[PDB]
Every structure is written in C-alpha cells, then in structure tokens.
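request received
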Amino acid sequence: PPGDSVTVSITSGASENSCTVEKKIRRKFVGREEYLFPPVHGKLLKCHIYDH
Amino acid sequence: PPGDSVTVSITSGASENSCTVEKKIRRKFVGREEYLFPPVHGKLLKCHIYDH
Amino acid sequence: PTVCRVPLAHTPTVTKWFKGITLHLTATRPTLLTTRKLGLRADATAEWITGT
Amino acid sequence: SITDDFTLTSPYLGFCPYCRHSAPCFSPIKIENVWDESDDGSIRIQVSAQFGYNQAGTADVTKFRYMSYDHDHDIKEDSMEKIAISTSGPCRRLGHKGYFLLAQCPPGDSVTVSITSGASENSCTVEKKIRRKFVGREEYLFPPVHGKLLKCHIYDHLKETSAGYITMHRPGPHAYKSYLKEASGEVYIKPPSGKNVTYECKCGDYSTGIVSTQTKMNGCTKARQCIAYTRDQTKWVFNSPDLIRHTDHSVQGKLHIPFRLTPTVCRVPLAHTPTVTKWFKGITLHLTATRPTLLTTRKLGLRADATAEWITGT
Amino acid sequence: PGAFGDIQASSLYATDIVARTDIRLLKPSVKNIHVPYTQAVSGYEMWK
Amino acid sequence: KCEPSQFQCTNGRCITLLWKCDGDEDCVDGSDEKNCVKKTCAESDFVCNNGQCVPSRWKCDGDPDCEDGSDESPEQCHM
Amino acid sequence: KCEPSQFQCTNGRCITLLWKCDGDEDCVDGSDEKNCVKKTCAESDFVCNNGQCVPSRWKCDGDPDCEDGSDESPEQCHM
Amino acid sequence: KFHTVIPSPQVKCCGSLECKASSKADYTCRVFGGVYPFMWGGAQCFCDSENTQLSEAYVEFAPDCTIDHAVALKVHTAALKVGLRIVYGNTTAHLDTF
Ligand SMILES: [Ca+2]
Ligand SMILES: [Ca+2]
Ligand SMILES: [Ca+2]
Ligand SMILES: [Ca+2]
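response:
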C-alpha cells in the first residue's frame, strides 16, 4: 500500500531485527481515468508489470 | 474508521478469502462543531443511528 | 431517532464599540459562526472558524 | 520530601472518555495527561494504573497493579506484556514506572493505552495531536547516517531520572450500592463479611453510625436515601479530577515524574551544496532539495532586508 | 489570555505565579462525577 | 409536559431518555427502571432462582436475601 | 578546550559525546571507557566470576584467560 | 506553557459550600446547586436535591518547562568593547579595551 518508507523485518526467532529506507511509494494507475483497482468492465490498455 | 474501501474477509480456515468494494467512508459529526468522539460534557442534540 | 452528545464551544468575549461588536473566538476544531441582522434585509454570513 | 516507597499508594478508577466500546465508562486505565516535548518523538503518558510493581507494592519490572471492579475495593496484579500503546499504529514501549509510561509513537490524532487480553481487556483513548518533529533547519523522516551534530533534547530512557513531582492525597469515601438490601420496606445494611462499614441516612432525620453486621435501620423506606462505605483504606491516591475528595485534602507525599528532559546531540542532514552563478551586483543560486529546506539571507549594511523561504524541489 | 506572557513568574521555582488564562467552569450535566471546564489556548504555543 | 426526547417520571420531573432502562434509579419513585424488558445480568451478579439479579457475594451469608431465600439454601452452598 | 558537547580525552583530542561509554575504545588511551559503570553483557558474552565481560567461546580454550582463571576451571568445563 | 490543575471535587450531601480566596495562579472556584453525582458503585449522597459540588481549577508550571521556557528582558544602552592587534617595529601586542 502507499507509504513513505519500505521495511523488511524478521518477525520472530532469535534474530529479530528490522530495516527501513526512505522511499516514496504512491498509488499508480494506467490510462486517463483514475481508479482504486481494476474495475470489472472496461477496455483493455497496454501496461507493464513485474513478472511473478 | 475512515477509509476508501470496505472489506469482508474470512481470516482462517480452508475457505480463506476476502472481498472488497470501492466505497468512500468519511468521518461524520452531528451539529455545528467538528469533533473526534462524543465529549463527556455537552448539550444533547437529535441524531439518527442504526439500532444494534 | 435518538439523542447524541455534542461539544459546547468556548464562550466568546465581546468587545463593544460604537455601532459594532467584536468577537474573540477560540476553537481547537472547526466551528460554525453565523450572523444575521434583524432588519428589513438580512446580511447572513457563514464561516468555519478554527484557531484563535 | 519526595518518596519512592510505592507500598503507601494504590491505583484508582478514572473516567475514560472513550472506552473499548466507544462510550464513556469507568476504567482502571484512564489517561490523565500526555506530554510530548522531546525532539525524537517519544511521549510521556500518565495512567491511573501502576506499572512496574506487584500487588504488595514492592518493585517488580514484569508486573503491574490496577484497581479491580469488585465492590471490596481490591487491587489486582497481572503480567505486563498485556499492555500496549498505540496512536494509529503500534507504539514501541521504552520505559515504565509508577503511573507513567514512556513510548515512541508514529504521528496520529489520539493516544490509546489498552490491555490486550485477560479478563479485563479494556482500552482508553484521549484526543491529542501527535505530529512528527525534527531538529535543525532541514526536514527529514529519520536521522540520516551522515550529517552534522546539533543540540537536541530527548526524554531520558532511564527510569531513575526526575522532572518534577505530583501530589498524593488521602483517599476519599467510596459508597457501593451493593451494601443496601431494601428487603420489603426497610433498608438493610450488610458489611462485606468481616469489615467495619459506616452508613449515613436522611430518612426524616440525619443518622450515621458504624456497623459490622446486619442492621434493620429505622424510618427508611427507599434504598436511595442511604449510603455505606468503608474507612480502613489508607493508601494514598493521585489528585485525580474523577474522585470525591476526603474531608482533609492535605498533601501527604510526593512522587517522582520519571524520564526527565535532558540535553544531548542529534544528527541532522546536510543539504546539497548550492551552485552559485555570479552576475553584476547579484547572484543566482541553483538549489536542490528532496525535502523542504530553509534558505535565509541578509544584507550586511545598515538596511538588513531579510528573507526566509522553505525551498523545496529544484 | 491567549497571547504571550499569559503566565508569568519571577523564576521557574518561584511560589508566586500569576496568570490569566480565562478559565470558565461549567455546570455538570452527566450523572457521574465530573468537572467540566474550558480554557483559552496556550499563549506560549501561539507565540511559538 | 416535556419534549418527547425527555421521559417524565410519575412525580413531576423530566429527565433525558438515556437514563431510561439503564440499570440506575433516577426518578424519586424508580419509574425509569421497572418498566423496560432488560434482563441481562453481569458476571458478578448471580441470578437467583426467582429471576432477580443479586450480587454473588450475597449468596449464603447467613441471612435470607431473595424472595424465596435461594441464597441460604444448603443446596446452593454446602456447610 | 572544547565545547561541552564533545568530551576531551586525556591527550588533547575532543570527540563527540555519542562515543562516550559505548563499549568501544575511542581515545588513544581508552579513558573514554573506564569512567562509566555499564555492566551489561551480551548473550554470547559470558560473564566471568570477576564480572569481566568475555566471549563465551573464550571459555576453557586450554589456557587461562580470566584474571581469576575461572575459564580453565574443571567445574565450568568438565574434561 | 501552562499545565492546568483540576483538584478532586468536594461535595456535601445536605449542606452548602462557599468559595474561598486562594493565592494560586488564576484560581477559579464555583459552587453548583443540585448535582447528585455518581461514581463506580452508584450514588454518593443521600439527599435527592440538596447536593452541592464545588469546582476548583488553577494553573501551574508544566513539568517540562525547565527546558522549553522563555525569558523576557529589558535592555538598556549597549556598551562596546573591542580587541586589537596593534603592531609596531618587530613587536606585536594583543589587548582588549572598552
Ligand atoms: Ca434510570
Ligand atoms: Ca446469603
Ligand atoms: Ca567509547
Ligand atoms: Ca578458555
């Protein structure tokens, strides 16, 4: 989700630590109409996503 | 609390899923004075609430 | 329908001069202040006042 | 004389404006004051409960004592890991002593101290504007790795420091409706087993006495016209705004306020060095800043036209 | 009230503080014990 | 009479509606308590055999408390 | 001298107060460390019978290491 | 910055309470007619309407004011003092004078 920092942590166990770096993460969208998540019905545009 | 979406989810079990719809939920106040929560001392106004 | 509880703002202090009054208002959260003359025409005003 | 022997004190029941169920109610975890004057974001919270002590009052870091809901006016103890502080997200707890907690918190609009589990899983919330703070003339989000050292004040994490004192007064009367019976048409008073309890009534005439057994009582028809409370409590209690004061409200002792404000050195960022373009009777500055930074100038003559702008961007 | 110097004292530990913060005490309304009150903002905070 | 958001006791007083059916007696004759249908009992309030809500410590203290005296019954507390 | 913000070693060099009593020898003689009363030890830092903070692996390595020689004691490490 | 202090209220069942002058800063006191207050445990007084409550509120110094505090000053005529590096021949001198 959008935020102002990125954190990686080891939740439990003996080596319980954390790390944080300043970084601006903003909501992104494709096209000319803002939205919160891909709606069910609409036209298909061209985008780029990281391959899982 | 105030937010931009409403989510119902089944936390644990075999059928662990979630659902989300876009809905603007904003903080509501009664009268002519903004407040965070009903204060201890004040006058009584007329308001409508859902019955528990 | 039921009754809620709403805050009562800090009572203002009036400074009186010739053909005019001055209000000294304090409000931690936004508050409404409306005025209207009692003559033939009513110069109604509305303002959300915050701070001193 | 400031005393540290907590065995002479006891917690009490405040009036939290916002309990767990989003309605004002009597709670053992009432927030009294919240102070935020440190430069690193930490805050000091006063709570009607007592942390870092056992039921008997002796020192014990792992346990906190609080006032039970029972009518016998009893003090209960519990393991401390049930206690958490939060404003918008979880807060990291730093220190604790007596009525006071020291926690580091993210920005938010309210301060909440809660008991997560157990029989008494309550909460308490008070409105308070907690905002991010920084030292120096350049904004940041956490202290950077490399920079110059300024002078800053932070709350001392140690619990042996002192920043003042708070008064301690005698406990007031506390009547419980459980002591009134009202069988058929007569008000009866019953002590909680082997205790001496006093009563007052105004059933036509003012009546008052001390009893330790069942009392028929005379001339009283409604339970609402009598009160009954105990007198053998002697532990002092804070000067709370939610307690009926005793007849003699004279100060009996003082308690340290831990986590005094101390001077130390913080680290602050150094902005990107500006590039100077020189022209006739004037210079042009090429500035860059990811976060707002302050740029002030002043002439060196009689007139001192002074500028002060929060440059951001490029 | 509401400006700089709303509270003054000859020194930090002096016992003769004098202030004028426009304290108003209100009539209690709720059943449980309470001391409702209202006050002007901190003049020191405003000046800061 | 008073505005409908305020309930009037059978004595000549009008109080706010939040005080009705709240477990506390506010009218001088207690008209705001024995009129609603609430029947809940807290954990510390033992429910007597007659249905009346009575504090738990009242039980088997040596004197009758309930209308039928269930508190003093040897069945409930064994001596 | 220097400003109070920086402690001065017994050599003529001033260092920031953040390096005072941090478990690290900062001054040329280590005077910045032998003045505070810190006595905590790490999980891997075994505490000798004399209170010295020493690594756990240093224990019973075949030669005396502590002042009192508790490291080589048969009680601590049975042969 | 001030820190408001609100002492524990005093209530008398069937009686009257009177304001008394105090030397504390901005000491404000009031007396209220009929209250019948409640605490955890029910009513605290037997009189139905003759209950009197007295409220106090004065102002003290905040505990953290020992560091975050301001001082007001009145400044008279300023005096000036300088240091010099007078030299002559092959000898240099340093001195301060008003
Ligand atoms: Ca009622
Ligand atoms: Ca019984
Ligand atoms: Ca060091
Ligand atoms: Ca060894």
